[PDB]
């Protein structure tokens, strides 16, 4: 994922109070009393990659002339859109 | 994967019909007639990064000892969970 440093404000402090509370439930370290959280605190963002859509670069012949088309497609709705249409273009 | 050559043929031809159909609505090239789509055809996949959750690495003091806590948070439920809790560790 992506990593970033956050500071030691009340949100970060309560993250430390969470960890000490859960550890005291397990009971392997003995009764711990939360003191403070110090720098550096690291926050990692976990992502899932998913397809938003597609794009296409076409060479299409129409009425015996050759054009360049640029189409986009949405993954979920399957709806298309024509972005560009230039011609006549020389063959590739 | 970002950019790729896709083959021509049935799915590609229907993209060529769409581009001509859309362009016939504008009319700057006049009434066209779809002929065929030729090589090379490019496909560009567009991905979307959605957040699955977060993870925090902390340096926590408790009962005058310094521990390293790894806690996790969900993006949808916002629920916290302690993954690891080791110590004492040397300070940064």
Swiss-Prot record, chains A, B:
Known uses: Natural monellin has not been mass marketed to the food industry, primarily due to the challenge of large-scale purification of the protein which is relatively sensitive to heat or acid treatment.
Keywords (A to Z) from UniProt: Taste-modifying protein
Site (Blocking, abolishes the sweet taste): 41
InterPro entries named in the record: Cystatin_sf, Monellin, Monellin_B, Sweet-Taste_Mod_sf
The keyword Transcription regulation is assigned to this record: no
Pfam family, one: Monellin
Keyword Glycosyltransferase included in the entry's annotation: no
SUPFAM superfamilies from the UniProt entry: Cystatin/monellin (SSF54403)
Its job: Taste-modifying protein; intensely sweet-tasting protein.
Subunit text: Heterodimer of an A chain and a B chain.
Official protein name in the record: Monellin chain B
Organism for this UniProt entry: Dioscoreophyllum cumminsii
């Amino acid at each position: 994922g992506e990593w970033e440093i956050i500071d030691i404000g009340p949100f970060t402090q309560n993250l430390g109070k969470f960890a000490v509370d859960e550890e005291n439930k397990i009971g392997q370290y003995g009764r711990l009393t939360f003191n403070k959280v110090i720098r550096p605190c690291m926050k990692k963002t976990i992502y899932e990659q998913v397809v938003a859509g597609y794009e296409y670069q076409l060479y299409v012949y129409a009425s015996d002339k050759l054009f360049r088309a640029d189409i986009s497609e949405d993954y979920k709705t399957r709806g298309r859109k024509l972005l560009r249409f230039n011609g006549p273009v020389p063959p590739p």
